[PDB]
Write a protein that binds this ligand. Structure first.
Ligand SMILES: Nc1ncnc2c1ncn2[C@@H]1O[C@H](COP(=O)(O)OP(=O)(O)O)[C@@H](O)[C@H]1O
Ligand SMILES: Nc1ncnc2c1ncn2[C@@H]1O[C@H](COP(=O)(O)OP(=O)(O)O)[C@@H](O)[C@H]1O
Ligand SMILES: Nc1ncnc2c1ncn2[C@@H]1O[C@H](COP(=O)(O)OP(=O)(O)O)[C@@H](O)[C@H]1O
Ligand SMILES: Nc1ncnc2c1ncn2[C@@H]1O[C@H](COP(=O)(O)OP(=O)(O)O)[C@@H](O)[C@H]1O
Ligand SMILES: [K+]
Ligand SMILES: [K+]
Ligand SMILES: [K+]
Ligand SMILES: [K+]
Ligand SMILES: [K+]
Ligand SMILES: [K+]
Ligand SMILES: [Mg+2]
Ligand SMILES: [Mg+2]
Ligand SMILES: [Mg+2]
Ligand SMILES: [Mg+2]
Ligand SMILES: [Mg+2]
Ligand SMILES: [Mg+2]
Lengths: 320, 320, 320, 319, 320, 320
């Protein structure tokens, strides 16, 4: 069960031309138009103030957005699914795994294993819910050109799942530039409503912005575009109940006039949207053959560290 | 003990149709009518100038609006209720804690514990006056998806209160956009008049405004909407005599990126309403894993500093 | 030495019902009737042209209004009272302090100590003339909610006055909206006829007009209402001879709301009344401390600057 | 100068009519002669024949016939011009502020009109040798912005006794328009009583903005202003004194859709536009220098001038 | 099978001036303009925003950029061409050799054998697919002045190919400075679009940057120029599908400054483009005459070590 | 057959002042202008970006810098002259002798015979082509003061050439410190164009650096200065088509400091410029006379050892 398709609004007395204009705009379900303010609906053409007000009021009638007791919210948060990361120690660290309905930014230095974690999450997302999975196909928006299905086949063989259907479930695309990356979100929102999607990996979020928006005086436009991208990701996560995972690259100190996100502090959203990343995981190589994952910031989980390893079957517990 | 419900206004020779029009307008209390100029009581359709003047007559007759001797105001202020922050050092710094019937704006950089302080205030608000509480249900309006009842349960366990009853009082809502944030206050007013409440937290005020109203030419509309929201908050604070707490994120250095509200000057209301925040607290990160709270501005308190820490049971005194 | 009560007009043979009509209109004094034009005495229903003309003629006979030699005006001006501001440097800057029977506007951005200056003036107003006081009770139409009767006690302790008695002679009111602020002037005119008052403080005098009259097309009504309020204040200053201090906010950047009078361009009254503020002081924050008060405009004073400080005992001389 | 109204008793008119005319406002036979039949009839207690004959003898006493142009040139060459206190501004006006006319100096807020009025009032008692008027001065102030300290300072600069100049300046304050009109009546009586040379109205349109507010009262405001300016013109023509008035002007956008904030549209309005003979635009400059531009004059041409305000009054631009 | 020439853009209704403007800008192929962002198309003078959006819209329908199932990507990657390196051990370690469409950065100490590998790869690129080749012309943008066709003749004689035709199918150029390198790539784009190419070699990529961009202050500009060069190489590899090989030099004792590479870590692209090199090979000279290759970094291949030898006919299997 | 002198410029519209500014900066031919980047043409003061771009474009139009078929490069390299070393054994070892256009470096222990090889090469540079010479005058930049113009006469008498003409065709200069070496290179480049010069000998390249740039912490500046000197030598070799020979001193023990010019590894250019020495020769003195020359590093020639001897007439084959 998920959102309510926009066709329900047709049952409420709205002519189909406005519905199709909203569909072209990008709002595919009643949730996406209910959550939108009057300004966004007014900005698109062919709609007047009265029509926008009536559709907004009807949508608010359809989906409840009023107050509720905290016990109801505790019950609701006790039913969301957490996706196992493939490692028992990291699963213990995350108190269940990667939660669905938020943003889990995992960042670290170069050659640490973020892509391996993304691969393992994408394959384990198809597991039955009783084994820690999410019972849903997993998308993969890839900007680094670093998607090799051989790892997915290896992990699917390890877990015993049929490789054919595991491959047939995971979708794929590539982002050659920032605008194509953004339009991929429109396509994903269009194509999500037709099936059950429980994961969406963007590896990595900031890779294209370090190069395309290269310039001392281009910082402002880059920041606004990144904020828009992150807002779209947040809306997608809230609307469809998916588990968005992204990736960032970091390095000691900084370079340039505070241009990149190469800092443990100063999250990806920066000064515009600081609350974008609900969960942040620092991935560190450590000393010797070690791998460490530390919860840098979480609203509920406390700071801690953990040990894990990467073998030919994916990410697993550190074998001694 | 509280305000006078508008049903008491019925015993003045006024028919119920315009009374219901005022009720649906947003004036749930006779005080909300007495604190309203003729312009706002006329702007609602269906009411003439003579009717508005007639109702305002007995509305002002019901409540005292005349001059009082300064000793009377000192007597009134000495009986005000202050809410303990949960830390003795902060209690000393604020000379009693967060005072009721006013606005306290806590602002600081990213990851300074503002949400933790809001959680601790929301749980300690339920304590009886004997222990320093306010003896009333709280209210939380969240604009970042950063409400975790686990912290509330932990603090309730620490203070000895029954967690089930503690979680059964704190209301909750989420603001997906600025218009929903503004609209929440209308239902909040009815919920406030219905039952005793003693704390309204809005975490955080200027979080959505950085996102929805992104644009050089949209600054004026953003400023007017923020001024309207803060005026509504001030009316709420004056009406039911409950403490309003708001939260603001500020970048350490002057990042720029056109005009913003992230600077240790220029209060939230801006140039239109520079007086919205009665009390202003600056939350700062010390050199070595320390937290400091500095009273940036108070009409009666002097500038000072304090030390505090955050443990698994909430905010508390600085443990050496 | 004060004004003659309107009841004296009853000795002129006029019918007492007309006297009560004038009293309820707002003219509590014979001087108020004398200064009024024919149209304002006719606009109230129940009074004919002949009656208004005869009371106006008798009032003009009672209080002289003809030409006087300039030496007489110099003698009258040399006997005026000046209220010490609590700082010797500022006292030298003002060539005596704040004069009675005049309007003193104070400029200032956010956090410039205007409220502290108002508090010190209100607590030094009841000082005997021997120490530069006014020997009269004070008033405070506080439209900001920032009136804390804790600084008044501190300054009273500094000056040796009994705290209970100095707190016992201060009138206080709060303005929640523009119309209530205006009616407070009628109430104050009612009060001052029966006791010696020597100060009227309005801090601020423009915030409510900033918030309530928010609109491009509402500017004209705002300007007319502000002009009416300032005219009422000027009349109050003329009749009873009380120094009227008013506080106006200011900002050093763009406004974007047409007039939006927060800048040095003209008095608060603006184009309609650019002459209400007899004296104008600009309060500015220097480097570090020791704010500067500059005489921005005065009929008989030159441009100058001064240094002053704010301690726990109130405003005082700057100590290096 | 003017002939006192008592000379009318040489004709033989019953003195009750003379007293009626005196209490009406006409304290000089010239005032009766200039008045038309309608005004002399509107006052009750006078018959048509009496008004006609009194106008006949008034015209007999006061010459109103045609005069050759050279006679008018000779009359105008004997006029007195009051020095403005600044030599450069004096050269701009080709003699200074003339008498028997109206000089309206208008400008934005904080230009120095009140200081100019003080300097004109203190230089008026100067003897004609220095370019003064030798007469007394009057100040009908509608703003409470009259400070004798500046008069004392400027008198000290010009080497006069402060007590004497102080004792030769009549002062009054106007709280409303009707009080201003009654002040004009009392000023007329006082000026027929004794010699005066200057009459200052600072400012003329200050009270009309506050008193006659609202859109629906514009016609009454215009009529009252026209009556006030007509009375001022009659005063100027009667006793031959220099009348100076002050007006405020701004370049607002939406603060008012009416009023008199305009460089054009003279103070007299559309009813009597010819009220102000001379008009001076007083403008704030860029760095520190104020300018005085002759906006309109029957004889003087358009020009500009440099002047400064010092603690001793108004003087030349000290670079 | 090759890229679609830019002339097809005129088939969509674009006047020839814009087509020639794009051609002179550097976009010789519809793939290049399709992959380009809106900002880069706007930057060239002579095209409006609407015109650029229209061109992008028509180009989108020509090349599919939407989502696709992972099985489609596995099919696409199964048919990719791998170029034999001339050594059986190297071929086994690389699981086919050097893969087209990706960057294979080989680096090592001085006199390790990178130039010989590049020479042998250039010869073997002309072999038909039946013998592990790619049957395509090769290029050599040599910057060290270390191109000797005698090795090419020797390898062609070993493989039995005619020397004349082997020489005739290799294009050569020399780079004297960085801007010449960039313009050389600009010309190489047109040369590639004019015919069929399969291998590009840059030996070495960073040699000229050590000569030109020296000094302590010239740190940023060198990094941006290198990032631009690597972005150009990536665009070429994606758009034409040509195996790109670049050479880097490393040392064990970095006795220099911050403007160095000198590290097995810190790839050539640096912190701006860490993902520039898809495959990374480390070449070392062990004790005696052993020559070892190691997969330093690969998205799919695991870490391994292999032995190889260099003899008179190029790189061959290490004879015991 | 030489370069194109800068007098061929000034016909493109560039005024004579810019030409003279380039002339005084060390750019004595159009080849040195074409090979230079924008940085080295902007660093000289008096030239703007537009003028530099125009002159660079004209220079690029003057000389061919585009791609070419490998057969063209083979044909070009077939006609490259190689100067005989005076010994048949070493001539066969070098496959023709010292090639023209590359930096040929020779090094060995003390008293091994490099200097005698330098005189023999200088004298043979004057021989006609059919005798193995280069038909060009020679230059000798001697740093250790070991240039005796008496072996030249002996070897010239051996070859039958007149002694006076042989001496008159050798331009000799001495370098006392590094900056003098650089300025003398500037002068040599200035005086190179006006005659046919085929050989340029530096003996030795690093002797002055060892005894001038002492100090443990001064290695970096010495390294950068050596890199600049070697870049200048490379530009001289490429631009004028001259044969550059330089001498290095080595000690077969290890090292005496952190950085040194010793060790058979670690070429003179260091890890900054490792490709400066195209051909490297190692000279050894074994048991008995046994003077051996070995090709250490070469891009085309293989490793081999040859026997030579030094006689009173110069250097010849080892007598039996
Ligand atoms: N086939 C593989 N089997 C096991 N580990 C692998 C394999 N391929 C790569 N790795 C590991 O991946 C690590 C780097 O993580 P990777 O996902 O390749 O890069 P990134 O840091 O860019 O996310 C390396 O340390 C290596 O040990
Ligand atoms: N109890 C106090 N004792 C001394 N100074 C105080 C005290 N409370 C506030 N202040 C001073 O008041 C200043 C601001 O003046 P205030 O009147 O509160 O504000 P504003 O001018 O905005 O109305 C602050 O800079 C602070 O130093
Ligand atoms: N005592 C004084 N001495 C000299 N100049 C003064 C004095 N008082 C005020 N001024 C000057 O008066 C100028 C404003 O002129 P004023 O007549 O007060 O204004 P307005 O044109 O608004 O009636 C100010 O620029 C100031 O410099
Ligand atoms: N003609 C040749 N035949 C065989 N090996 C050669 C030949 N020329 C050079 N080499 C080899 O080249 C190696 C070093 O040179 P090279 O491979 O070009 O290094 P680099 O890539 O660092 O320039 C030597 O170990 C030598 O064995
Ligand atoms: K966070
Ligand atoms: K404040
Ligand atoms: K003024
Ligand atoms: K990589
Ligand atoms: K020697
Ligand atoms: K080499
Ligand atoms: Mg990765
Ligand atoms: Mg937060
Ligand atoms: Mg204040
Ligand atoms: Mg004035
Ligand atoms: Mg090499
Ligand atoms: Mg030697």
């Amino acid at each position: 069960f998920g959102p309510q398709p926009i066709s329900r609004l047709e049952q409420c007395g709205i002519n189909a031309n406005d519905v199709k204009k909203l569909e072209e705009a990008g709002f595919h379900t009643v949730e996406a138009v209910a959550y939108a303010p009057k300004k966004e609906l007014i900005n698109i053409k062919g709609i007047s103030e009265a029509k926008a007000d009536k559709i907004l009021a009807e949508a608010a009638k359809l989906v409840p957005m009023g107050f509720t007791t905290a016990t109801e919210f505790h019950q609701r948060r006790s039913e969301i699914i957490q996706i196992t990361t493939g490692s028992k120690e990291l699963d213990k660290l995350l108190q269940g795994g990667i939660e669905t309905g938020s943003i889990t930014e995992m960042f670290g230095e170069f050659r640490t294993g973020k892509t391996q974690i993304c691969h393992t999450l994408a394959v384990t997302c198809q597991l039955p819910i009783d084994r820690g999975g999410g019972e849903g196909k997993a998308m993969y928006i890839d900007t680094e050109g670093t998607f090799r299905p051989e790892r997915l086949l290896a992990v699917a063989e390890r877990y015993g799942l049929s490789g054919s259907d595991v491959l047939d479930n995971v979708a794929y695309a590539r982002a050659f530039n920032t605008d194509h990356q953004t339009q991929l979100l429109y396509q994903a929102s269009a194509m999500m409503v037709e099936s059950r999607y429980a994961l969406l990996i963007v590896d990595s979020a900031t890779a294209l912005y370090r190069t395309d928006y290269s310039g001392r005086g281009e910082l402002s436009a880059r920041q606004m575009h990144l904020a828009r991208f992150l807002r779209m990701l947040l809306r997608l996560a809230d609307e469809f109940g998916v588990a968005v995972v992204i990736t960032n690259q970091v390095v000691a100190q900084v370079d340039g006039a505070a241009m990149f996100a190469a800092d443990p502090k100063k999250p990806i959203g920066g000064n515009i949207i600081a609350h974008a990343s609900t969960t942040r995981l620092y991935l560190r190589k450590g000393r010797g053959e070690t791998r460490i994952c530390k919860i840098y910031d979480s609203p509920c989980l406390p700071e801690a560290e953990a040990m894990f390893a990467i073998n030919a079957d994916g990410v697993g517990d550190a074998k001694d």
